[PDB]
Amino acid sequence: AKGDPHVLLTTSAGNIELELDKQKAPVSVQNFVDYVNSGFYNNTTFHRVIPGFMIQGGGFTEQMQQKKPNPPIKNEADNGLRNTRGTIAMARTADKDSATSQFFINVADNAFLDHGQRDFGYAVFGKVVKGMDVADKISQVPTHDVGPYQNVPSKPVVILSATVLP
Numbered sequence: 001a002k003g004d005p006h007v008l009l010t011t012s013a014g015n016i017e018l019e020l021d022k023q024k025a026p027v028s029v030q031n032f033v034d035y036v037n038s039g040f041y042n043n044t045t046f047h048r049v050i051p052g053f054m055i056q057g058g059g060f061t062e063q064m065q066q067k068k069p070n071p072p073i074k075n076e077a078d079n080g081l082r083n084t085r086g087t088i089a090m091a092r093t094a095d096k097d098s099a100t101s102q103f104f105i106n107v108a109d110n111a112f113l114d115h116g117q118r119d120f121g122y123a124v125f126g127k128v129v130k131g132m133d134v135a136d137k138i139s140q141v142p143t144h145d146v147g148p149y150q151n152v153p154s155k156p157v158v159i160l161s162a163t164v165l166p
Contacts, residue, residue: 001087001127003029006165007036011046012158013141014134016105017165018088018126024079025125028090028099031073032125033164035101040067041162048104048151051139055157056091056104062156064146069100077115081124084109088126096120107132107139 003022008015020029035041035058044067046057060066075096083089083106091102105128106113115121128135138157146152 001025001081001124003126005029005033006129007033007126008161008163008165009041009131009159010161010163011134011138012156012160013138014131016131016134017129019129020088020126021079021081021124024081025076025123027073028076028123028125031070031099032103034070036162036164039162040069040101041159044101044159046138046153046157046159047149049139049141049143049153049157050151052108053139054104054106054108054110055135055138056102057157057159059091059100059102062158064149064152067101072098072100075099075120075123076125077121077123079123083111083113083122083124086128086132087124088128089113089122089124092122099123105135107135 001021005020048056090099092099
């Protein structure tokens with residue numbers, strides 16, 4: 001997951017730097033970079049946090065309002081990258097080709113999320129090169145239920161800015 005692009009996510013809990021795998025996840029990387037470059041992720045939150053599993057964000061505001069994303073992309077989970085601790089992957093629904101803006105960072109080795117004979121899996125497209133301790137921190141913030149959502153941080157963890165680094 002070192003395709004080339006580096007992205008810095010500055011959150012209210014600290015900074016996380018990512019290196020995206022443009023070679024193995026071209027579509028996922030272009031989709032992600034397009035969102036960051038457009039300023040889409042600014043003011044979105046990590047709305048789903050589960051210790052020992054992952055932290056997911058990039059879709060809702062602090063008031064749990066969902067931002068209208070761009071059209072869904074094809075699933076690249078069969079690119080051979082695994083959902084090991086420290087990787088970034090695309091969140092999606094039942095349809096394997098339903099990913100849009102939401103992504104999650106694995107804070108544990110989640111092999112059950114990998115492309116396999118039982119399910120297409122979740123597309124990994126990068127890795128955290130800096131800030132894993134921050135991701136761990138975010139994963140353990142107190143949470144509660146908001147609407148149909150569970151594991152929502154009681155105190156929103158906001159992505160104040162997302163930028164492609166030089």
